[PDB]
Design a protein around this nucleic acid. Sequence first.
RNA 1: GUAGUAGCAAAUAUUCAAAUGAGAACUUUGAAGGCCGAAGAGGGGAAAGGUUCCAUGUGAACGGCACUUGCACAUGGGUUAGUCGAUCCUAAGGGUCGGGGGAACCCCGACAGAUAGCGCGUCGCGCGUACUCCGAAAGGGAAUCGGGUUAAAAUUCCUGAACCGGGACGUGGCGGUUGACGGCAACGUUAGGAAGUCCGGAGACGUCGGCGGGAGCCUCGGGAAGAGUUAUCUUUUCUGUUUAACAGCCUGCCCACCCUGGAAUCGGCUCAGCCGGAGGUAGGGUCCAGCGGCUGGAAGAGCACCGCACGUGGUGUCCGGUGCGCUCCCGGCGGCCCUUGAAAAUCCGGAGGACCGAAUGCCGUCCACGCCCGGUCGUACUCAUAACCGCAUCAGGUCUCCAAGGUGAACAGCCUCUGGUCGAUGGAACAAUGUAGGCAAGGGAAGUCGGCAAAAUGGAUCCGUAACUUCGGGAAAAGGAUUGGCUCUGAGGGCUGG
RNA 2: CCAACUCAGAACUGGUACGGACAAGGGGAAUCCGACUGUUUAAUUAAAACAAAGCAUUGCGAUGGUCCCAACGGAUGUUU
Lengths: 91, 68, 76, 114, 251
Amino acid sequence: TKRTKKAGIVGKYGTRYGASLRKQIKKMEVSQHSKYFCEFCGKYAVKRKAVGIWGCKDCGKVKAGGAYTLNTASAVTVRSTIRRLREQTES
Amino acid sequence: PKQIHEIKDFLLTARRKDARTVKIKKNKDMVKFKVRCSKYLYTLCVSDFEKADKLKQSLPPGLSVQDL
Amino acid sequence: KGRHSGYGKRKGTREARLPTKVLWMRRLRVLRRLLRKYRESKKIDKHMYHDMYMKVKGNVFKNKRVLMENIHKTKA
Amino acid sequence: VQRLTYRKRHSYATKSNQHRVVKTPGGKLIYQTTKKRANGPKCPVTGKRIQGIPHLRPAEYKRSRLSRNRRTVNRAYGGVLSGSAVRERIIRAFLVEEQKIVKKVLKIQKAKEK
Amino acid sequence: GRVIRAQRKGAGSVFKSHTHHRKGPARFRTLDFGERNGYLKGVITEVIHDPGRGAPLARVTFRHPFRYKHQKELFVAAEGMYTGQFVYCGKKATLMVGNVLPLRSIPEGAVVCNVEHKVGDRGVFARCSGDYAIVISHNPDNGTTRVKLPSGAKKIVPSGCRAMIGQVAGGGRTEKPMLKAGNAYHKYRVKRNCWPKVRGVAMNPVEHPHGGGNHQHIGHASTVRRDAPPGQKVGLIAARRTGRLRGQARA
RNA sequence: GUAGUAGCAAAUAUUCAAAUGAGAACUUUGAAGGCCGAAGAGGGGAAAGGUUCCAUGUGAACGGCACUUGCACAUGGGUUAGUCGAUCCUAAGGGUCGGGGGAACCCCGACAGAUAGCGCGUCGCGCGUACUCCGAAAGGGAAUCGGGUUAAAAUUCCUGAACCGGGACGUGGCGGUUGACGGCAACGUUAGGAAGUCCGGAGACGUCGGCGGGAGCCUCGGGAAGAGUUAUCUUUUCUGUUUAACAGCCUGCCCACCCUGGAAUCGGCUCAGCCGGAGGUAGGGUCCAGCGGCUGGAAGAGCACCGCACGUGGUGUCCGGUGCGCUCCCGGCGGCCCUUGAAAAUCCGGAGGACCGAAUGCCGUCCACGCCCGGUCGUACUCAUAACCGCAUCAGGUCUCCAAGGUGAACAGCCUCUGGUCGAUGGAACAAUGUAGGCAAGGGAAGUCGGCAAAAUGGAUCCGUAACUUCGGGAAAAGGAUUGGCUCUGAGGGCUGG
RNA sequence: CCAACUCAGAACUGGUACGGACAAGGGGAAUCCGACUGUUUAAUUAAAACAAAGCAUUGCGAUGGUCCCAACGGAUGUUU
Ligand SMILES: [K+]
Ligand SMILES: [K+]
Ligand SMILES: [K+]
Ligand SMILES: [K+]
Ligand SMILES: [K+]
Ligand SMILES: [K+]
Ligand SMILES: [K+]
Ligand SMILES: [K+]
Ligand SMILES: [K+]
Ligand SMILES: [K+]
Ligand SMILES: [K+]
Ligand SMILES: [K+]
Ligand SMILES: [K+]
Ligand SMILES: [K+]
Ligand SMILES: [K+]
Ligand SMILES: [K+]
Ligand SMILES: [K+]
Ligand SMILES: [Mg+2]
Ligand SMILES: [Mg+2]
Ligand SMILES: [Mg+2]
Ligand SMILES: [Mg+2]
Ligand SMILES: [Mg+2]
Ligand SMILES: [Mg+2]
Ligand SMILES: [Mg+2]
Ligand SMILES: [Mg+2]
Ligand SMILES: [Mg+2]
Ligand SMILES: [Mg+2]
Ligand SMILES: [Mg+2]
Ligand SMILES: [Mg+2]
Ligand SMILES: [Mg+2]
Ligand SMILES: [Mg+2]
Ligand SMILES: [Mg+2]
Ligand SMILES: [Mg+2]
Ligand SMILES: [Mg+2]
Ligand SMILES: [Mg+2]
Ligand SMILES: [Mg+2]
Ligand SMILES: [Mg+2]
Ligand SMILES: [Mg+2]
Ligand SMILES: [Mg+2]
Ligand SMILES: [Mg+2]
Ligand SMILES: [Mg+2]
Ligand SMILES: [Mg+2]
Ligand SMILES: [Mg+2]
Ligand SMILES: [Mg+2]
Ligand SMILES: [Mg+2]
Ligand SMILES: [Mg+2]
Ligand SMILES: [Mg+2]
Ligand SMILES: [Mg+2]
Ligand SMILES: [Mg+2]
Ligand SMILES: [Mg+2]
Ligand SMILES: [Mg+2]
Ligand SMILES: [Mg+2]
Ligand SMILES: [Mg+2]
Ligand SMILES: [Mg+2]
Ligand SMILES: [Mg+2]
Ligand SMILES: [Mg+2]
Ligand SMILES: [Mg+2]
Ligand SMILES: [Mg+2]
Ligand SMILES: [Mg+2]
Ligand SMILES: [Mg+2]
Ligand SMILES: [Mg+2]
Ligand SMILES: [Mg+2]
Ligand SMILES: [Mg+2]
Ligand SMILES: [Mg+2]
Ligand SMILES: [Mg+2]
Ligand SMILES: [Mg+2]
Ligand SMILES: [Mg+2]
Ligand SMILES: [Mg+2]
Ligand SMILES: [Mg+2]
Ligand SMILES: [Mg+2]
Ligand SMILES: [Mg+2]
Ligand SMILES: [Zn+2]
């Protein structure tokens, strides 16, 4: 059954800390505890070991990523920015 | 303590120069031949009583044989 | 024989006296054991074993008897 | 029931003060200190155990106390790398060396272009 | 009066950094001939957590240039680094995330981290999680480079200074609310003895300029001048302004 | 003077007989009645104490009554280690050279510097990053186990059986295709080259939760041995019924790994997960744990019981079951972190192959056996309602290990067994006032600053549960019903047999 | 063939007694203060006081900010 209408994973905090802080922390609470796709082996077996560290259970590849997500938004932009600069220099 | 499984092996260790003594322990179902060497006490178990008497008189002279 | 077991002789909760988890674990091990032996004896195939395996985990069958009856009914 | 006491002057339940209860031929219970669990050899990266070697305290591996066959594996990098890891290195060494030969030859054909 | 809390920190004692479980200083290789002229290949062996440091660290193994032995290094991990990756350091290293290049070889607009201030100092700028520096322009005549630091300040550095391509991994850490005094306790337990903080207005006059009074209140401007002596310099030090930063001020 | 006055009152409790003595409510023995009730008033240890330990004796004093008594006094006796510790290693840190400061006492502390030396040959070559220091009787760490023994000591003494670290050579074995052999493989076998240099691992690590395994304990039945009860009942109740280090062999948990093979009608699988063309299921293997099994040790011991003498002999020590049980250990998985949870000594393995023998006798050998050696200091006892601190034999304070049966959710409370103990100065009365514990007609907070105090409620099962709310709660809301004994009924399992 | 103890129901029965000792929430409608858990005047005050997460402001890019030091130097700093 549906055990909580909206609280979800932040139900472990009971009635403490205020709704906004529970709502705010829910995004990162879900993301840091979720499985992520491993580009190396192709499995959804990447989980956070510590803040910024993401290891694949299957192939054993350990990757440095975001604090609470494997890939941050700025990380994608940096890769494309660096790629564009490399092409011009390597032209 | 180590256990000797072959009567032939027991005789070889009984002739060692460090074999201080041999003791005969007669249980209700077998006879145990125990020879005291420098490092280990070697024990041989002989279930057949008659077969044990033959070994008893085949020990080298000069070795202290005792009956327990 | 069942003496001294009424409500006036109980101090702990039903869970404290016997955890629900213990009862659930007993049932699954009994039912999963029963399914394996039927598959080994070829009374059921792997396709039916898998279907029954997930229904046992889903709390469909409450004891050994009802599981056996369902298998017989399903095979007919 | 019989209750026990430490047989040494160590009075605190530290990891090195672990014990087992043994019943002696005299009919009494007594403690005997038990050594801590040891990991045994493990692979440098994956961390999986190296097969064929028992798990003992470091001093128990001393050559005088352990037979040679129990602390070795008959293979290159035996006791240090698993069989899979050794296989990976051998193939990598051969293939990488072959690729170097291809690179060397490939640049000779272009060098003469003039 | 007595020595205030701010003054007691300089003596060390119970205010020293908690560094028992730290893995060591994270820094580039020592500048040598290989990095000045060509490139040297390294391999990432593991990405580890350093207590008290948000950013993860990367252990890299290098082949020693002239000795028969391995050369171990500890780098601040860039976002995207992974174990088994090849890392190239030197003047001729390609422009890829994780490589360490001199600023002279890095084009304008690139994102870099752990930027050296002095050639060979092994990295001092943009080392915290999620932080980076942006190369602005090059000055071939002076042999210097302009970079934008995380604080938004522009700085001149010699073009020989090295920098790692990419941003520091672990970004977004501070967005998550702590929610609990205990979480703050664990955060600062591995940093130093700075938490919790008692407000000066809650103290007595003997131990803080803000102390005392039949009501809790500062009683004088909390903005103190730059040249105030230790023990008097509390509050907003040399504040150019105060109050909510609205408009262009918060730029 | 006060004054033979205040006062001796917490921790349930003593009684009878006899012995001893000048003298006994207080010493000792026996019997009875109670208590601690395994988070103990039991059995140890770390600090701290320092002879308080043991025997004998005792004029006084002291033990807030008394004493024949003793933690008092007097005399004498008592602490045995290659294996238990210290010792060794490093931690936070401490103490320092040089250098820099300083009138100097001193300050900083490897930071201003020709380090310490090490390795291999036989004095030479090679290497060489400024501490060979102190810092743990709970961190790391070479090796000892039963049985017995004293008035007082023991993993230290005795006997037996092992192990560790060194030293030296001998015999045999092993290798020479100079440096073994077997397996497709995982790997196996007891031996089975090697220097500088280089590399990895062990040592080595948080916390919580669920499962699984091992040991000890608890518990049930049968066999035999002794004991208790017996007017009646009781094939009954109680006590026990033992097996050390170490050595060999076997077993092969949970995982990991290997070979064959090639999977959708997807399957396998946990309590929970989860796993598979990056090769599942299946079939057959390898390895790892053990506080697992067998044998040796080892019945010759220990224990119980029955005799004979006043040391000595005999009999037995057997066969099963059970588990959300308890304590400890281990395995594997999962949860948690803006927290990721020591170091070094030491040990093992590996990469490389300089150099080296024999034409077969030398060389090599981490194999088996034999031979020799083992420093110094601590070790008694208390560990506390009397051996530590609190001026004391002070109801206070002081770290930790072992932990039975019944009731019950329960190391709750209450009762019991092992062990301990009746140690708190006694006797006679039963006024007031008091302290502690209770009860009370009718009324029900009128008492009082105030429901202070006390009373009422209380476990479990079923039913039912509002406002408000940050949607998580509120909630055990509120409200109501049930509960013993006895005799039954139903439901929920395991292992074998095609 | 061998099993352990959880649940449910029924009859009978006692002076309606039965969580029989032990054990073990009183409950409700509101106001003030502090969000909460935490901490505090050892030996008269445990609280509305302190702390707290959250929020905001200030200084500082190392030839630096803050601080210690008689001097030399040092803490923050294994930091950015
Ligand atoms: K092996
Ligand atoms: K002052
Ligand atoms: K603090
Ligand atoms: K504050
Ligand atoms: K003030
Ligand atoms: K002590
Ligand atoms: K010693
Ligand atoms: K130690
Ligand atoms: K440790
Ligand atoms: K002994
Ligand atoms: K042992
Ligand atoms: K002793
Ligand atoms: K006391
Ligand atoms: K009275
Ligand atoms: K009233
Ligand atoms: K609390
Ligand atoms: K500074
Ligand atoms: Mg996989
Ligand atoms: Mg329970
Ligand atoms: Mg549940
Ligand atoms: Mg604050
Ligand atoms: Mg104040
Ligand atoms: Mg002032
Ligand atoms: Mg009087
Ligand atoms: Mg009194
Ligand atoms: Mg009296
Ligand atoms: Mg009393
Ligand atoms: Mg008395
Ligand atoms: Mg009592
Ligand atoms: Mg009692
Ligand atoms: Mg306990
Ligand atoms: Mg007296
Ligand atoms: Mg005495
Ligand atoms: Mg004396
Ligand atoms: Mg020792
Ligand atoms: Mg230190
Ligand atoms: Mg000094
Ligand atoms: Mg000097
Ligand atoms: Mg130096
Ligand atoms: Mg030393
Ligand atoms: Mg030392
Ligand atoms: Mg120790
Ligand atoms: Mg003693
Ligand atoms: Mg290691
Ligand atoms: Mg929890
Ligand atoms: Mg268990
Ligand atoms: Mg298989
Ligand atoms: Mg035997
Ligand atoms: Mg006997
Ligand atoms: Mg425990
Ligand atoms: Mg080799
Ligand atoms: Mg002693
Ligand atoms: Mg005693
Ligand atoms: Mg004690
Ligand atoms: Mg004093
Ligand atoms: Mg019960
Ligand atoms: Mg109890
Ligand atoms: Mg009344
Ligand atoms: Mg009345
Ligand atoms: Mg009324
Ligand atoms: Mg009134
Ligand atoms: Mg009145
Ligand atoms: Mg009251
Ligand atoms: Mg309410
Ligand atoms: Mg109002
Ligand atoms: Mg509060
Ligand atoms: Mg306090
Ligand atoms: Mg007070
Ligand atoms: Mg108070
Ligand atoms: Mg607010
Ligand atoms: Mg100065
Ligand atoms: Zn992967």
